[PDB]
Amino acid sequence: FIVEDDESLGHKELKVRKGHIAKLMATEYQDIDVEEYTWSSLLNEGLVEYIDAEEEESILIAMQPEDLEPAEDVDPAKRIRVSHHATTFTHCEIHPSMILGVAASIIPFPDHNQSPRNTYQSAMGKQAMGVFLTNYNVRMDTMANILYYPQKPLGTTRAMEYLKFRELPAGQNAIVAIACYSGYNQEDSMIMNQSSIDRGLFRSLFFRSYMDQEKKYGMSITETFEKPQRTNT
Amino acid sequence: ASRHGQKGTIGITYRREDMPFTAEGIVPDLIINPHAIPSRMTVAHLIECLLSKVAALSGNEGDASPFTDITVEGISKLLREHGYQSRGFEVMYNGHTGKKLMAQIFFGPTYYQRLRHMVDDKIHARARGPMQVLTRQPVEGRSRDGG
């Protein structure tokens, strides 16, 4: 975001206002007759800007607009956050959650995790099972794993709304008890319900495609797709 | 695996009448160990389970974005408004005998992913089999009945 002087309010403010937000939502809900207001409209009006790491060295960025821009009782449950005690900002973050990649945006509450666990989940989210594409029936991929009943997560991030995770999910909402029940879940093991498995919990499709060609080595050395017989083969 | 680096295999499968049950008759689809929680410091697994419980009870999908002003206490208040214990604990009963467990069990929905590592694609044995052409030692790979 672009932070300007904004002499009407007497302090620094983002150039993007509620009218631009309303125009963006009007265009978005038109997509689901007024003027089309897109991302390039924000870019051409100077509301947003493209900053690389070299230009990032000469700017001061506010994390949030409603906290660090306006001049300055607290909830003890909320995390402790500083306001940096400085009003000379040139830019603002659009949202800090966009520092994450595609795989880390699937993680619910990644700021409440240890960072190696976030790295491990970003690794293992690619190994999950879901619906990779909706046209898997007409694709002869070498290996394909499709869950019977994908479910969108109950706890979901805003960012995965753009990752189409609620449209092509990669897991199921399982009712999970954290318990030392029988000693059969020790050292990362888990006890799954067999009755739930019988009703389709985590049941998946597996497809494997075999390719074969009849190649002509020469005149008489050519392959043929046929049913062989024990007498002459 | 959960969405938090909490991977693991199925130790055993129990039927519904052997699983622990709450007073509402709800049995888990999955039992994971408490000892996976404290050393790994995976607090977001617990908050995700709590928020998913509130989400399923209220019908509104939970906002689990990282840097929002969503606290555990707000989710706990919402869970208490639905008539459940605010920290996600439930009085569970032993399925083998019907007696109440002395400790109450953290309970609720959690998103779990089925990873592509099956045991059937990894179980392998070989008493004798084909040998390599060069070294005349057992070949490599379970797809070739290897050693």
């Binding site: 009007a26 979901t156 | 928020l51 989400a55």
Partner: peptide, 19 residues
Amino acid sequence: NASPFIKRDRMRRNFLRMR
């Protein structure tokens, strides 16, 4: 306490009600 729910259908309905 902020509402921990991604409720975007009702906000779309509200914005269409403004229109």
